[PDB]
Design a protein around this ligand. Structure first.
Ligand SMILES: Nc1nc2c(ncn2[C@@H]2O[C@H](COP(=O)(O)OP(=O)(O)O)[C@@H](O)[C@H]2O)c(=O)[nH]1
Ligand SMILES: [Mg+2]
Ligand SMILES: [Zn+2]
Lengths: 38, 203
């Protein structure tokens, strides 16, 4: 559907709800905009 | 799970960055405001032969008119467009500064250089003078945000570089705001030819 042929899933990464930056599980605040991890 | 990339759009104030990103209608209607940084993130979906991809394009709120942008603007960018105005030579002269600021934070992510406003007859920065991209492993395109001329080219080149697939194609153009000025097809052909000619000439 909205996926892409061959794409890889990485565990724990979270998408910032404010700026859409993809963060590491260990980041508690978005490295770009400083929004808290959902 | 979807494919998405942070794309930072940088360049001097007045070069047409906002006008450009706004051509993509759904990216405008679905844009998200980032208050800490004063940014609008436009989600620009393109449908490729392998599925949809999304460029989350970061547009400033004009702060570039007062100095460099904060680190948070650049952080985790996966690709970039540097824009200048082909009617203002100073905007081209500042391209190296924007490139420096970008690479300082992001290292050598894929970057497209775009000369905007080629619909304006009295062009000042012409193909023969545009050489910064050759110097730095960058792709260049003429664009006209107001006429949608070459709108998809930076995004297609970046998609191919990021995904590692030189045969990736867009199956259709996204829905764009209708042209507000007409890009003369003959002028476009001439500018494209001029760029080829210059590409073959030595620096
Ligand atoms: N003729 C022409 N004018 C443009 C084009 N793109 C932007 N402009 C205008 O240049 C002015 C600044 O555009 P803007 O998008 O605000 O530039 P920004 O400061 O880089 O975001 C505005 O008056 C635009 O209407 C274009 O492709 N062709
Ligand atoms: Mg702007
Ligand atoms: Zn964020």
């Amino acid at each position: 559907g909205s996926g892409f042929e061959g794409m890889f899933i990485r565990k724990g990464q979270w998408d910032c709800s404010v700026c859409c930056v993809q963060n590491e599980s260990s980041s508690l605040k978005c490295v770009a905009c400083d929004a808290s991890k959902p | 799970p979807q494919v998405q990339f942070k794309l930072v759009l940088v360049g001097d104030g007045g070069t047409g960055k906002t006008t450009f990103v706004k051509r993509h209608l759904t990216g405008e209607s679905e844009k998200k405001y980032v208050a800490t940084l004063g940014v609008e993130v436009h989600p620009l979906v393109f449908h490729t032969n392998r599925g949809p991809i999304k460029f989350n394009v970061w547009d400033t709120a004009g702060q570039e008119k007062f100095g460099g942008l904060r680190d948070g603007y650049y952080i985790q960018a996966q690709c970039a467009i540097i824009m200048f105005d082909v009617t203002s030579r100073v905007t081209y002269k500042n391209v190296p500064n924007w490139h420096r600021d970008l690479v300082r934070v992001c290292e050598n992510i894929p970057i497209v250089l775009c000369g905007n406003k080629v619909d304006i007859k009295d062009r000042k920065v012409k193909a023969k003078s545009i050489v910064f991209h050759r110097k730095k492993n960058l792709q260049y395109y003429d664009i006209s945000a107001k006429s949608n001329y070459n709108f998809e080219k930076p995004f297609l080149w970046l998609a191919r570089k990021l995904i590692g697939d030189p045969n990736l194609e867009f199956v259709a153009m996204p829905a764009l705001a209708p042209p507000e000025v007409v890009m003369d097809p003959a002028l476009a052909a001439q500018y494209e030819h001029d760029l080829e000619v210059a590409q073959t000439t030595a620096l």
